Amino acid sequence: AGWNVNSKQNIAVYWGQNSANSQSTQQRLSFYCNDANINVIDIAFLNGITPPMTNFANAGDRCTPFSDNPWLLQCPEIEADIKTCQANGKTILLSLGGDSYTQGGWSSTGAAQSAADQVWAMFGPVQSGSSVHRPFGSAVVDGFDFDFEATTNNLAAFGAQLKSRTNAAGGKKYYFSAAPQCFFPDAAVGALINAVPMDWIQIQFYNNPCGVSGFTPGTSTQNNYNYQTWENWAKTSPNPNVKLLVGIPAGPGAGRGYVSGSQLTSVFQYSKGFSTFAGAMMWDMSQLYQNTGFETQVVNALR
């Protein structure tokens, strides 16, 4: 039944950007919704907000741009697949920003609040009184992942307005995650995650010296891998009960600091010792499914 706050074996995986970058490495979203081990999928990315822009790599081939915004896609296959995945018991979030987000956020709190209301009208419940375009039609996401990686002015105000709308909503639970890099504090989402409660934070423990590649097996004194710093911060954050996922590259081509074998098992056994630990995150689905046997290694490390 999707995200499980009481489990230490959650696995969140990004889908949409085809990191593996071959013609066949990213199937449609629902191909990956029969995996008993993957209970959260983040759709990557809404890479523009004001104005809105969607990029789903070659999944875009089965979409049609909206007539008045060529960078915003109408995606009936992703729509159908979100509904299928949710019927199959998966939590499907939309990931906001990503490494190709260049708009730099909003000049005022008011502009950030208006942008949040537009994202909610585009991707949350269908609003009968709204003219906004809906990339996923009558599909409704299960919440939002904040993956901003450059300075994003007034992201805290944007996040607070979107959280206001999800907190007011009926129907189902909406979740909030953020994906800071492991360097502490995080420049891009630091203000957001110090202001707005998250359900979990999926830290990118890669592309940085604090990543899982810097973990020292055989000891619980860790000079580089900084999970402990993140747990200490989490306990006084706006949601003091927020959970952490350990985010890793799903293949050597997915990011710097890929780990496997005993390094991978050991860093997960260390991380499992912490009360905030709730599982793993991986970048990304295309890399994971190409990297034969790697998913089994991660599942076996979390057991």
Residue numbers in the entry: 19 to 321
Q: Which text from the study accompanies this structure?
A:
The endo-chitinase Chit33 from T. harzianum is included in the GH18 family.
To elucidate the molecular basis of its enzymatic activity, the crystal structure of native Chit33 was solved at 1.12 Å resolution. The crystals belong to the P 21 21 21 space group, with one molecule in the asymmetric unit and 50% solvent content within the cell. A short and not well-defined α1, a bent α8, and the presence of two β-strand insertions after β2 are widespread features of other family 18 chitinases. Moreover, the short loops connecting the secondary structure elements are responsible for the definition of a tiny TIM barrel, which diverges from the bacterial-type chitinases embracing large βα loops, which even include a full chitin insertion α/β domain (CID). In particular, the longer β1α1 loop makes a deeper cavity in Chit33, conferring a more tunnel-like appearance to its active site. A TRIS molecule from the buffer solution was captured at the active site of the native crystals, making polar interactions through its hydroxyl groups with the catalytic Asp165 and Glu167, as well with Gln222 located at the end of β6. As shown in the Chit33-NAG4 complex, Ser118 presents a dual conformation in the free enzyme that is fixed upon ligand binding and orients to make a polar link to O6 from the sugar at subsite −2.
